[PDB]
Ligand binder design. Structure first.
Ligand SMILES: CCOc1cc2nc(C[C@H]3CCOC3)cn2cc1NC(=O)c1cccc(C(F)F)n1
Length: 289
């Protein structure tokens, strides 16, 4: 149901894969498994991800993740998942519907001078991201790479989960290859366990990013890891209000504490003490009801 592109088409519509940033070219972002380029096809802006080995990955591994991206999106179409338009397999490329407002990570940092997200917008983003994770877990998929860089924002700032190349079927199993972003990863995931409970923990880190506006890791910050503020709040050194993003004017204490409560539950170090995604979904819905 996708569209088969040949590599020469995508090379042409990305200005020969111009590596200069758009603020300068065609490069919009980068990850461990490839670079995302802006493309223009028949007067339509698209996002083209050309896969590349940037994290010491083999050819078979990259191809396997390429096939997993297509498999997941072939069967999973949802309001809060990115929409694939096609691919190229003759270099591997994935062509997506363009997300004009980029990643949640970039909007939380106000990259390129974009205005700060309101608390109202952040609540809808948190709810939409949870709905996307729920849809994946409902379809027996573990995402394994949940982070704010992988939550994209469309023309209505609707949250769209992306990057399913590491996804695995779910019905507690183990792997020798530990993958993911450390600052978002549950302890058991860092140990090699594969479980949907690790997605919940990662989503908790995203919720802390949404509340505070701070990146999950910042080497020039104390604490360096954002998840460490939970310990500070529990040990009563500070409060969640001490860390609320000051770049909002519409955040109220009750709903902010409501989303922190969800985040705190998601961030239980013991995996069986975490809520499932469905409970996270209902807690976030009660936050705004
Ligand atoms: C990796 C960063 O990706 C983007 C960055 C970015 N920056 C802008 C412009 C800024 C300037 C002002 O605010 C927005 C759009 N945009 C779209 C981006 N991605 C997509 O459209 C997109 C869509 C589906 C999948 C994927 C991915 F999985 F491959 N990516």
């Amino acid at each position: 149901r996708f569209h088969s592109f040949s590599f020469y088409e995508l090379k042409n519509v990305t200005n020969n894969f111009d590596e200069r940033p758009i603020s300068v070219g065609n490069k919009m972002g980068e990850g461990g498994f490839g670079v995302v380029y802006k493309g223009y096809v028949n007067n339509t802006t698209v996002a083209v991800k050309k896969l590349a080995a940037m994290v010491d990955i083999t050819t078979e591994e990259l191809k396997q993740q390429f096939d997993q991206e297509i498999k997941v999106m072939a069967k999973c179409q949802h309001e809060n998942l990115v929409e694939l338009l096609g691919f190229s397999s003759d270099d591997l490329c994935l062509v997506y519907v363009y997300m004009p407002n980029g990643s949640l990570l970039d909007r939380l940092s106000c990259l390129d001078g974009t205005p700060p997200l309101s608390w109202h917008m952040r609540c809808k983003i948190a709810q939409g991201a949870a709905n996307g994770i729920n849809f994946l877990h409902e379809n027996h998929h573990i995402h394994r790479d949940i982070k704010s860089a992988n939550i994209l924002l469309d023309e209505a700032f609707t949250a769209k989960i992306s990057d399913f190349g590491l996804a695995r079927a779910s019905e507690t199993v183990m792997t020798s290859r530990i993958v993911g972003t450390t600052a978002y990863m549950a302890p058991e995931a860092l140990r090699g366990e594969i479980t949907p409970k690790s997605d919940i923990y990662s989503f908790g880190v995203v919720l802390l990013e949404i509340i505070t506006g701070l990146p999950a890791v910042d080497e020039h910050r104390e604490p360096q890891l954002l998840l460490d503020i939970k310990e500070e709040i529990e040990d009563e050194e500070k409060t969640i209000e001490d860390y609320i993003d000051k770049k909002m004017n519409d955040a109220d204490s009750t709903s902010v504490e409501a989303m922190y409560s969800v985040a705190s539950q998601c961030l239980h170090e013991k995996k069986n003490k975490r809520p499932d995604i469905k409970k996270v979904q209902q807690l976030l819905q009660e936050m705004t009801a």
